[PDB]
Structures are given as C-alpha cells and as structure tokens.
Scaffold this motif. Structure first.
Motif, PDB file in Angstrom:
ATOM      1  N   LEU A 115       1.026  48.723 -77.874  1.00 44.23           N
ATOM      2  CA  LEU A 115       0.171  49.733 -78.490  1.00 44.23           C
ATOM      3  C   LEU A 115      -0.565  50.544 -77.433  1.00 44.23           C
ATOM      4  O   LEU A 115      -0.625  51.778 -77.510  1.00 44.23           O
ATOM      5  CB  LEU A 115      -0.815  49.074 -79.454  1.00 44.23           C
ATOM      6  CG  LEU A 115      -1.923  49.971 -80.011  1.00 44.23           C
ATOM      7  CD1 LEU A 115      -2.104  49.727 -81.494  1.00 44.23           C
ATOM      8  CD2 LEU A 115      -3.230  49.715 -79.281  1.00 44.23           C
ATOM      9  N   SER A 116      -1.130  49.868 -76.430  1.00 46.25           N
ATOM     10  CA  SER A 116      -1.830  50.584 -75.371  1.00 46.25           C
ATOM     11  C   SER A 116      -0.878  51.478 -74.590  1.00 46.25           C
ATOM     12  O   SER A 116      -1.221  52.617 -74.249  1.00 46.25           O
ATOM     13  CB  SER A 116      -2.525  49.596 -74.439  1.00 46.25           C
ATOM     14  OG  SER A 116      -2.833  50.208 -73.201  1.00 46.25           O
ATOM     15  N   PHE A 143       5.315  47.583 -80.611  1.00 48.75           N
ATOM     16  CA  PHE A 143       4.005  47.207 -81.118  1.00 48.75           C
ATOM     17  C   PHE A 143       4.068  46.707 -82.556  1.00 48.75           C
ATOM     18  O   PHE A 143       3.469  45.679 -82.880  1.00 48.75           O
ATOM     19  CB  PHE A 143       3.051  48.401 -81.012  1.00 48.75           C
ATOM     20  CG  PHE A 143       2.086  48.521 -82.155  1.00 48.75           C
ATOM     21  CD1 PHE A 143       1.036  47.631 -82.295  1.00 48.75           C
ATOM     22  CD2 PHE A 143       2.231  49.527 -83.089  1.00 48.75           C
ATOM     23  CE1 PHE A 143       0.154  47.745 -83.346  1.00 48.75           C
ATOM     24  CE2 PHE A 143       1.351  49.645 -84.141  1.00 48.75           C
ATOM     25  CZ  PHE A 143       0.311  48.753 -84.269  1.00 48.75           C
ATOM     26  N   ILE A 144       4.795  47.412 -83.426  1.00 47.76           N
ATOM     27  CA  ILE A 144       4.810  47.053 -84.842  1.00 47.76           C
ATOM     28  C   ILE A 144       5.689  45.841 -85.132  1.00 47.76           C
ATOM     29  O   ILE A 144       5.553  45.231 -86.199  1.00 47.76           O
ATOM     30  CB  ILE A 144       5.256  48.252 -85.695  1.00 47.76           C
ATOM     31  CG1 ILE A 144       4.738  48.114 -87.127  1.00 47.76           C
ATOM     32  CG2 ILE A 144       6.765  48.389 -85.686  1.00 47.76           C
ATOM     33  CD1 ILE A 144       3.235  47.962 -87.225  1.00 47.76           C
ATOM     34  N   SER A 186       7.916  52.157 -77.699  1.00 44.54           N
ATOM     35  CA  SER A 186       6.650  51.434 -77.620  1.00 44.54           C
ATOM     36  C   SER A 186       6.049  51.205 -79.003  1.00 44.54           C
ATOM     37  O   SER A 186       5.473  50.144 -79.266  1.00 44.54           O
ATOM     38  CB  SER A 186       5.672  52.189 -76.727  1.00 44.54           C
ATOM     39  OG  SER A 186       5.857  53.585 -76.843  1.00 44.54           O
ATOM     40  N   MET A 187       6.169  52.186 -79.901  1.00 43.05           N
ATOM     41  CA  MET A 187       5.633  52.025 -81.250  1.00 43.05           C
ATOM     42  C   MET A 187       6.319  50.881 -81.984  1.00 43.05           C
ATOM     43  O   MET A 187       5.660  50.079 -82.656  1.00 43.05           O
ATOM     44  CB  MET A 187       5.786  53.329 -82.031  1.00 43.05           C
ATOM     45  CG  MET A 187       5.580  53.180 -83.526  1.00 43.05           C
ATOM     46  SD  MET A 187       5.072  54.716 -84.313  1.00 43.05           S
ATOM     47  CE  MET A 187       6.379  54.919 -85.521  1.00 43.05           C
ATOM     48  N   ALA A 215       1.597  42.494 -79.114  1.00 40.50           N
ATOM     49  CA  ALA A 215       1.660  43.888 -79.533  1.00 40.50           C
ATOM     50  C   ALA A 215       0.596  44.766 -78.888  1.00 40.50           C
ATOM     51  O   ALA A 215       0.746  45.994 -78.895  1.00 40.50           O
ATOM     52  CB  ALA A 215       1.532  43.976 -81.053  1.00 40.50           C
TER      53      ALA A 215
END
Length: 363
Positions: free
Chosen positions: A46-47, A314-315, A310-311, A42
């Motif tokens: 996140l980046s 990441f989650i 992308s969010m 993740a």
C-alpha cells in the motif's frame, strides 16, 4: 554492462523485502491470526503504491541517481527496525517506510534502465526478475530463519548497505487499458494471496517446517524462472498473448485444485515445484500486452502496470488473511476464483477483438 546488473539486483532486493517476512510471520504469530499477518504484509504494498507517483515526482525534482540511494537507505533502515522492533506499531511503521523505500527506488531504477539500455526485452527481464524476487523472498527468508528468527532482516539490511556502496561506485481512450490492468490485478491477486497462505496452509495441512517451506518455495521459484527463461520465446511463437494468458491461468487453476486435493507430504512438495510456472509465464505476457497496446505513452503504461501490481499486492494479503481465519483452505478458493475471473476476462476480450476483426473483414 554492470549498470543493468546492479540495478537488477536493486529491484530484486526491493521486491525480496516484500516476502522476506512471510516465514518469520508464523513465528510472530505467537508473540495472532491471519488477519494482522495479511495487514502487515499489505502495508508495504500500500505504501509503495501510494508513494510511486510521489516518488516519480521527487525523482524528477532531483533523482535518477540520488532517489535510488535515499530509497536504499530507507529500505535498510526499515529492515533494521524490523529486526530490532517488537511493538506492533513499530512493525507497522517499519513496513510503511519499507514501502516508502520501494516507491522511491522503483521509478528511478526503471527510468535508468529505460535510459541506460537501448531496449522491449529489458522490460521483460525486469518483469521476470520482479516475479522471481517476489517468489524467492519467502524461500530465502525461511532458509535464514533456521539460524535465527531475526537473521534474515539483518542480512537484508547488510544487502541494502552493499547496494548503497554499489550504487555509489556505479551509475487517448482508456478502454484499451481496462483489459490488461484487471489482468495485472488478477496476477498480483493470484500470486501474493497464494504466497501469503501457502506457508500457513502447509503449516496446517501436513505440519511443515520453516526449512521445508523455504526449500519448497525456492524450488518452485527456481523452476518457474528457468521454465520462463527457457521456453518463453517458444510459447510466444506458438500462442498469442491472450490465448497464452488464458492457458497459463487454466494451468494455475488445475495446479491449485490439485493442491487442495493434496494430503501427502511429497505430493504437496511436488505440486509446489510446478505451481509457479503459470504465474511466471503470465507476468511477462502481461508486460508484453501493456507494451503492445501503448505506442507512444510507454511511461504511462509502465506506471499503470506498477501501480496496479502494487494495488493487487496490497489487496491480496488482507483478503487472504481474513479468509484463512474464516477457513483453512479459503484463500486458495479465492485464488481459483480470481484466476477463473481472469480467464473469463481474457475470453471476453478475445471475443470482442474477434467480433471487431470479423466485422472489418465483412466490411
């Protein structure tokens, strides 16, 4: 021309870097649980989500040919550092700078393709290639994991350097967006989390092998990509956007349920081949929905699509890893729940639009 081809390869490599570490991660589990694996996967997303707007601003300051190159350099450095490094902080930093590279590359390539092609369908091809690379990442990574446990990262770094050389030798109310954005999350929650669990899950239920997981994932990705590229127009003719998305989510629910109810090796192998059809047809449908709602602020809609993809990317892995630690089959239950939530969201939106149209006709 070849410009779209090299840019497509660039985005393919960037999104392949996300999943190239999926099969190496079980090998890195004995150097662990699913929680740190999910966090590691993740960090990249996140980046990338954080730096996508900053990357766009930097490209505006100078870019559209140089930001792509610097992102490729960052990607290659990150993959080489992953190849050599062993410290968990080193791995974390490598994934962070890899996310930096993704966030520096993606805006440049999408802007160039929006400006180096007289098209609509090209963004659909972008979505198809992004999904195909995301799915194929673990497959190719596991295939190279046989010869060496660090060979895939060396191959990715070499591909990044080759992309360097190729790029050098080439080149309003927000209520409408609330429905697809969640849908986007759902897809990028349904896919990534599942793809984070599958390998580990297959390594536990039936005692799979890295080559076997790799071939299963590669076959699933190729089958999904071919099914999309050979039936998307027909399925778009038959259903509309929301109905097709709902049916694809129901298909994904059914296939994941079969995966939970699968024990034989060849049964789970066969399920793996067809598990990705629903997602590979969902993603271009979400892209077309985003293009259809927005008529003037297309760049804003594309940026929202990318940032929420992308969010969710990441989650997803974090929750998937925590649930895998808690229970062996929990991440698949989470994926089924998220898919059902997406189905309910689609049904609610369809009922809202139907009520509005019925009132207007009654008017």
């Amino acid at each position: 021309n070849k410009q779209i081809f090299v840019l497509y390869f660039n985005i393919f490599l960037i999104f392949l870097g996300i999943g190239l570490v999926i099969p190496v991660l079980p090998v890195y589990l004995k150097d662990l649980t699913g929680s740190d694996l999910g966090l590691l996967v993740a960090a990249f997303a996140l980046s990338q989500m954080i730096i996508s707007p900053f990357g766009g601003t930097l490209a505006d300051k100078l870019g559209k040919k140089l930001i792509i190159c610097i992102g490729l350099i960052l990607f290659s450095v990150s993959e080489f550092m992953f190849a050599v490094g062993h410290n968990f902080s080193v791995l974390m930093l490598s994934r962070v700078i890899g996310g930096m590279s993704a966030g520096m590359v993606m805006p440049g390539v999408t802007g160039l393709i929006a400006d180096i092609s007289p098209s609509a369908k090209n963004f659909g091809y972008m979505s198809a290639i992004i999904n195909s690379g995301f799915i194929l990442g673990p497959g190719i990574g596991g295939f190279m994991a046989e010869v060496s446990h660090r060979m895939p990262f060396y191959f990715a770094g070499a591909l990044g350097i080759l992309a360097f050389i190729m790029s050098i030798v080439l080149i309003i109310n927000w209520k409408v967006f609330i429905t697809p954005v969640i849908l986007t999350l759902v897809l990028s929650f349904g896919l990534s989390a599942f793809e984070t669990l599958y390998s580990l899950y297959t390594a536990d239920k039936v005692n799979y092998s890295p080559k076997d997981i790799s071939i299963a994932i590669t076959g699933g990705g190729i089958f999904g990509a071919l099914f999309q590229i050979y039936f998307f127009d027909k399925f778009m003719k038959y259903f509309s956007e929301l109905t097709f998305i709902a049916w694809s989510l129901l298909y994904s629910v059914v296939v994941l349920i079969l995966l939970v109810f699968a024990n034989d090796y060849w049964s789970i192998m066969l399920i793996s081949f067809v598990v990705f059809i629903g997602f590979d047809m969902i993603r271009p449908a979400i892209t077309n929905y985003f293009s259809n709602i927005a008529g003037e602020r297309q760049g804003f809609a594309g940026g929202l699509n990318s940032t929420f993809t992308s969010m969710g990317n990441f989650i997803g892995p974090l929750i998937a890893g925590a649930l895998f630690d808690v229970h062996i089959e929990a991440p698949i239950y989470m994926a089924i729940g998220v898919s059902l939530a997406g189905v309910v969201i689609v049904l609610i939106e369809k009922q809202h639009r139907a009520a509005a149209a019925d009132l207007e006709d009654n008017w």
